[PDB]
Design a protein around this motif. Structure first.
Motif, PDB file in Angstrom:
ATOM      1  N   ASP D  47     -42.237 -48.063  66.175  1.00 25.69           N
ATOM      2  CA  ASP D  47     -41.154 -49.067  66.350  1.00 25.69           C
ATOM      3  C   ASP D  47     -40.598 -49.475  65.144  1.00 25.69           C
ATOM      4  O   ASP D  47     -41.282 -50.657  64.628  1.00 25.69           O
ATOM      5  CB  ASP D  47     -41.322 -50.020  67.388  1.00 25.69           C
ATOM      6  CG  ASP D  47     -40.003 -50.896  67.623  1.00 25.69           C
ATOM      7  OD1 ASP D  47     -38.977 -50.762  67.067  1.00 25.69           O
ATOM      8  OD2 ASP D  47     -40.142 -52.031  68.357  1.00 25.69           O
ATOM      9  N   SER D  48     -39.502 -49.032  64.301  1.00 21.63           N
ATOM     10  CA  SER D  48     -39.358 -49.534  63.319  1.00 21.63           C
ATOM     11  C   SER D  48     -38.112 -51.006  63.247  1.00 21.63           C
ATOM     12  O   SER D  48     -38.099 -51.216  62.141  1.00 21.63           O
ATOM     13  CB  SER D  48     -38.496 -48.589  62.436  1.00 21.63           C
ATOM     14  OG  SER D  48     -37.258 -48.045  63.273  1.00 21.63           O
ATOM     15  N   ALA D  49     -38.199 -51.334  64.400  1.00 23.06           N
ATOM     16  CA  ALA D  49     -37.469 -52.641  64.411  1.00 23.06           C
ATOM     17  C   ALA D  49     -38.145 -53.456  65.550  1.00 23.06           C
ATOM     18  O   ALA D  49     -37.378 -53.732  66.835  1.00 23.06           O
ATOM     19  CB  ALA D  49     -35.735 -52.514  64.740  1.00 23.06           C
ATOM     20  N   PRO D  50     -39.132 -53.885  65.362  1.00 22.03           N
ATOM     21  CA  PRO D  50     -39.773 -54.695  66.505  1.00 22.03           C
ATOM     22  C   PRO D  50     -39.343 -56.124  66.988  1.00 22.03           C
ATOM     23  O   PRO D  50     -38.459 -56.649  66.363  1.00 22.03           O
ATOM     24  CB  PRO D  50     -41.300 -54.701  66.001  1.00 22.03           C
ATOM     25  CG  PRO D  50     -41.185 -54.702  64.686  1.00 22.03           C
ATOM     26  CD  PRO D  50     -39.956 -53.986  64.005  1.00 22.03           C
ATOM     27  N   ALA D  51     -40.053 -56.663  68.015  1.00 17.12           N
ATOM     28  CA  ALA D  51     -39.209 -57.811  68.400  1.00 17.12           C
ATOM     29  C   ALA D  51     -39.833 -58.842  67.398  1.00 17.12           C
ATOM     30  O   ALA D  51     -40.725 -58.678  66.776  1.00 17.12           O
ATOM     31  CB  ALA D  51     -40.124 -57.978  69.968  1.00 17.12           C
ATOM     32  N   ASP D  53     -40.625 -61.788  68.456  1.00 16.24           N
ATOM     33  CA  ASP D  53     -41.090 -62.832  69.155  1.00 16.24           C
ATOM     34  C   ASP D  53     -42.596 -63.073  69.093  1.00 16.24           C
ATOM     35  O   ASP D  53     -43.306 -63.776  69.837  1.00 16.24           O
ATOM     36  CB  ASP D  53     -40.703 -62.814  70.504  1.00 16.24           C
ATOM     37  CG  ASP D  53     -41.296 -61.598  71.452  1.00 16.24           C
ATOM     38  OD1 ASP D  53     -42.093 -60.554  70.618  1.00 16.24           O
ATOM     39  OD2 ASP D  53     -41.188 -61.248  72.470  1.00 16.24           O
ATOM     40  N   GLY D  54     -43.192 -62.386  68.094  1.00 14.56           N
ATOM     41  CA  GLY D  54     -44.489 -62.559  67.802  1.00 14.56           C
ATOM     42  C   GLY D  54     -45.394 -61.163  68.324  1.00 14.56           C
ATOM     43  O   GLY D  54     -46.684 -61.141  68.034  1.00 14.56           O
ATOM     44  N   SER D  55     -44.652 -60.432  69.061  1.00 10.65           N
ATOM     45  CA  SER D  55     -45.142 -59.253  69.661  1.00 10.65           C
ATOM     46  C   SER D  55     -45.748 -58.013  68.494  1.00 10.65           C
ATOM     47  O   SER D  55     -45.087 -58.248  67.550  1.00 10.65           O
ATOM     48  CB  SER D  55     -44.294 -58.418  70.591  1.00 10.65           C
ATOM     49  OG  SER D  55     -43.866 -59.035  71.788  1.00 10.65           O
ATOM     50  N   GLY D  56     -46.583 -57.414  68.712  1.00 14.15           N
ATOM     51  CA  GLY D  56     -46.958 -56.413  68.032  1.00 14.15           C
ATOM     52  C   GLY D  56     -46.071 -55.322  67.936  1.00 14.15           C
ATOM     53  O   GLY D  56     -45.022 -55.380  68.521  1.00 14.15           O
ATOM     54  N   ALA D  58     -45.276 -51.410  68.597  1.00 14.32           N
ATOM     55  CA  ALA D  58     -45.763 -50.076  69.410  1.00 14.32           C
ATOM     56  C   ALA D  58     -45.839 -48.845  68.458  1.00 14.32           C
ATOM     57  O   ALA D  58     -44.680 -48.704  67.573  1.00 14.32           O
ATOM     58  CB  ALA D  58     -44.922 -50.127  70.515  1.00 14.32           C
ATOM     59  N   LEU D  59     -46.677 -48.172  68.582  1.00 16.51           N
ATOM     60  CA  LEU D  59     -46.857 -46.932  67.788  1.00 16.51           C
ATOM     61  C   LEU D  59     -47.877 -45.898  68.466  1.00 16.51           C
ATOM     62  O   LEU D  59     -48.374 -46.263  69.341  1.00 16.51           O
ATOM     63  CB  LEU D  59     -47.378 -47.121  66.339  1.00 16.51           C
ATOM     64  CG  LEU D  59     -48.693 -48.196  66.272  1.00 16.51           C
ATOM     65  CD1 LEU D  59     -50.012 -47.287  66.559  1.00 16.51           C
ATOM     66  CD2 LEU D  59     -48.565 -48.738  64.808  1.00 16.51           C
ATOM     67  N   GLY D  80     -50.907 -47.289  70.667  1.00 16.23           N
ATOM     68  CA  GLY D  80     -51.195 -48.881  70.451  1.00 16.23           C
ATOM     69  C   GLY D  80     -50.440 -49.720  69.799  1.00 16.23           C
ATOM     70  O   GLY D  80     -49.291 -49.329  69.633  1.00 16.23           O
ATOM     71  N   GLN D  81     -50.937 -50.508  69.052  1.00 16.19           N
ATOM     72  CA  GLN D  81     -49.744 -51.271  68.447  1.00 16.19           C
ATOM     73  C   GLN D  81     -50.314 -52.151  67.215  1.00 16.19           C
ATOM     74  O   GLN D  81     -51.781 -52.509  67.239  1.00 16.19           O
ATOM     75  CB  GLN D  81     -49.006 -52.384  69.248  1.00 16.19           C
ATOM     76  CG  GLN D  81     -50.225 -53.720  69.727  1.00 16.19           C
ATOM     77  CD  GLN D  81     -49.459 -54.186  70.898  1.00 16.19           C
ATOM     78  OE1 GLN D  81     -48.636 -55.132  70.570  1.00 16.19           O
ATOM     79  NE2 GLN D  81     -49.655 -53.774  72.171  1.00 16.19           N
TER      80      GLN D  81
END
Ligand SMILES: O=C(CCCC[C@@H]1SC[C@@H]2NC(=O)N[C@@H]21)NC1CCN(c2ccncc2)CC1
Ligand SMILES: O=C(CCCC[C@@H]1SC[C@@H]2NC(=O)N[C@@H]21)NC1CCN(c2ccncc2)CC1
Ligand SMILES: O=C(CCCC[C@@H]1SC[C@@H]2NC(=O)N[C@@H]21)NC1CCN(c2ccncc2)CC1
Ligand SMILES: O=C(CCCC[C@@H]1SC[C@@H]2NC(=O)N[C@@H]21)NC1CCN(c2ccncc2)CC1
Lengths: 121, 121, 121, 121
Positions: D47-51, D53-56, D58-59, D80-81
């Motif tokens: 995910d090249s534009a992650p949240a 909000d402190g989330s990891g 994803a990959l 995973g992440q």
């Protein structure tokens, strides 16, 4: 046999189990995570005559997440093995299935892994 | 409710189960694949008060692959749900853990999926 | 080689893939389910010189669920094999990880299974 | 952002990855376990534009276990992440599918989990 006792995983959940002479596992599970409170009945099975070559003892058990206080319409099975010795340990992988419509069934199963030791968190 | 009885998966394995009023699953499993012969004890849990919104009934069970004839030093758990109706099914995913040294632990768990129906495929 | 083509799974998702001479898989994935719309880039790998004993061809690929239209902060990997012949088929199991806080990480991974064929639903 | 570089899991395997601006993962994998020697090509997505909000993040990625030295007719995907921070980690679950006849398909997929850190354990 080594399996009977109180175990804790990395989330702080408490696994109180008795390994019976017939190969049965019987006890309670209290999850520190999720839609769960207090204790839940568990039942499972273990290899009552494992290899003597240093292999662990295969086992598994199931919790349905219903008790007298709530019902999360879901169940988890843990599959793994007991590794005795220096710091005894139960290494598991688990599958958590949520009640779903057949249309939402594709998203109905979580997978994870829990490691249990007898050390209170 | 419709859980008790004989079920078959796509391998031709035979799952004989009784769903008790206390949430218990008890029965026998006969595997048509792998290091297995004749019947094995199973025990598990199911949601005895499932949602009334059309969702399946969450459940799971364990077999340790030891009986009076042989011991495969392994155990399978199935996690899934019962979906009633004209074509009733129990859709599961499963984890099969083999006894292993710590060295070989990484390779000790197989994963798969079994669909059980009331009619043999 | 057999893998290059347009495949559909049991959900009606569309898997358009090219198996390259270097062992690479490259294409697009359109999911008929979930927080997804239109096509997503995929990339993966396959055994470019499989056994000739009737075994399938091992492969896997990844989709991150971001495209120009939306971002579901999640990724799925499919691991499986291509089985050629009468009705060619790609049998897979998959893992779908959602971006999560480390505290919610225990619930961050879904597991499932998809079977692909070249037959338009 | 912090993904590119060299990572190590608990088996001592070495994951060398570059996270490109287009969401691509490319690199090499050297496994300290199993039917593997030297480096293998990997490719994946993240995910090249992650949240925010402190989330990891994803990959996932795939290795087919064929290189110039050997061919293990199998492939692993890791889902995973990435979780940044003082003790950055990539938490994964993985599926390893082996080439198999239809007969042996039920036993063709292993499941496990790898935690990657920036420091060798
Ligand atoms: O949380 C629980 C029951 C507690 C599970 C505890 C888990 S067992 C593996 C792990 N090891 C532990 O020790 N503890 C955790 N069940 C939820 C799951 C998510 N649920 C939905 C509902 C609708 N849509 C999506 C998801 C609702 C029911
Ligand atoms: O075959 C069985 C027990 C019967 C399992 C049947 C499986 S249950 C899920 C599926 N659904 C069914 O209906 N049937 C199958 N156990 C083996 C596994 C592989 N084993 C090793 C040992 C050492 N190294 C590698 C592998 C030895 C023990
Ligand atoms: O739905 C997608 C992306 C589409 C996935 C499509 C899946 S891939 C395997 C299967 N085979 C297909 O062909 N299609 C499906 N991602 C969600 C997952 C659930 N999400 C959360 C968020 C917060 N809490 C819980 C869950 C948000 C993101
Ligand atoms: O060992 C490998 C490839 C290397 C895998 C390394 C794995 S990747 C996930 C984990 N994380 C790591 O860092 N390393 C490990 N492939 C074997 C698997 C078992 N195989 C058979 C064949 C026939 N019957 C039974 C089993 C043959 C091929």
């Amino acid at each position: 046999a080594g399996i009977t006792g109180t175990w804790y995983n990395q989330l702080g959940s408490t696994f109180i189990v008795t390994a019976g002479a017939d190969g049965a596992l019987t006890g309670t599970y209290e999850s520190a995570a999720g839609k769960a409170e207090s204790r839940y009945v568990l039942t499972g099975r273990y290899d009552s005559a494992p290899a003597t070559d240093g292999s662990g003892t295969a086992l598994g058990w199931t919790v349905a997440w219903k008790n007298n206080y709530r019902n999360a319409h879901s169940a988890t099975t843990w599959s793994g093995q007991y590794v005795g010795g220096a710091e005894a340990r139960i290494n598991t992988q688990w599958l958590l299935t949520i009640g779903a419509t057949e249309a939402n069934g594709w998203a109905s199963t979580y997978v994870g892994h829990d490691t249990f030791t007898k050390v209170k968190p």
